[PDB]
Design a binder for this molecule. Structure first.
Ligand SMILES: OC[C@H](O)CNc1ncnc2[nH]c(-c3ccccc3)c(-c3ccccc3)c12
Length: 272
């Protein structure tokens, strides 16, 4: 009943990569655009079999949609919601950040996605600007579930024990503790993302006692960069998010009650 509408032709590369490359795949009938992550299994299929598996669970407006996959011998093809805006990373001006009302809006949408994930028992484990993509109307989408894992199954939480992620975004308990809860770790990395969006710079290489920028934060020296660029309201949120003890760290329900989070800043859509 559907025409010749599923032959995928590779228009252009959208970039690398690490695991391989991403291409813009159009269908030559509908001109229906999707993105195609191509990975060389030659270059342990558990990293990608789980990535497909987790991707099949996901169905949210702030999470990159999964459309299917392709074996084709030794090369896996992941077909994925195309985000024509690129990465949130490219909207952040070094040393400046972005307008606070844009940052707030991206933050709202990130929380919306992370609540969704945590509600279906999935933790992303690598939230950073590079993995947050933007669609045609500048809506934010969580992307890349290659490090993601189930932390809750049949209403039973599992502790995480392997260290992963990206050092500037990683929470301190994952470098200190053998085992630790998944959700506070995600929350922490959203804190670092917010800091990057409002200041255009990352506060520290890693959240260790051997890191003076990090010790400066525990000591409340908010007269230093990047904190001096921020503004008292979002900074007060950041003081709740970037709390070393994960049991004292603010939870998402409480972030939605925060004063900056609920501050009117930005007028409705440019059109209509
Ligand atoms: O990693 C799992 C992602 O879902 C696959 N990547 C994408 N997926 C879905 N939509 C996308 N638009 C992009 C993209 C668009 C415009 C400019 C730059 C990037 C990319 C992209 C591709 C290659 C590298 C980095 C970013 C991308």
């Amino acid at each position: 009943a559907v025409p010749f509408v599923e032959d995928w032709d590779l228009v252009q590369t959208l970039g690398e990569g690490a695991y391989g490359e991403v291409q813009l795949a159009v269908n030559r009938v509908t001109e229906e655009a999707v993105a195609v992550k191509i990975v060389d299994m030659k270059r342990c299929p558990e990293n990608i079999k789980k990535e497909i598996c987790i991707n099949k669970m996901l169905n949210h407006e702030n999470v990159v949609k999964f459309y299917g996959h392709r074996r084709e011998g030794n090369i896996q093809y992941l077909f994925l919601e195309y985000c024509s805006g690129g990465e949130l990373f490219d909207r952040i001006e070094p040393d400046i950040g972005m307008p606070e009302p844009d940052a707030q809006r991206f933050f709202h949408q990130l929380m919306a996605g992370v609540v969704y994930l945590h509600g279906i028992g999935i933790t992303h484990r690598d939230i950073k600007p590079e993995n947050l993509l933007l669609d045609e109307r500048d809506n934010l989408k969580i992307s890349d579930f290659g490090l993601a894992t189930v932390f809750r199954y049949n209403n039973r939480e599992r502790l995480l024990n392997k260290m992963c992620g990206t050092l500037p975004y990683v929470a301190p308990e994952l470098l200190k503790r053998r085992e630790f809860h998944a959700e506070p770790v995600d929350v922490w990395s959203c804190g670092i993302v917010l800091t990057a969006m409002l200041a255009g710079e990352l506060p520290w290489d890693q959240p260790s006692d051997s890191c003076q920028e990090y010790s400066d934060w525990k000591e409340k020296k908010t007269y230093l960069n990047p904190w001096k660029k921020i503004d008292s309201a979002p900074l007060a949120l950041l003081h709740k998010i970037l709390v070393e003890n994960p049991s004292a760290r603010i939870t998402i329900p409480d972030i939605k009650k925060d004063r900056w989070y609920n501050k009117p800043l930005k007028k409705g859509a440019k059109r209509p």
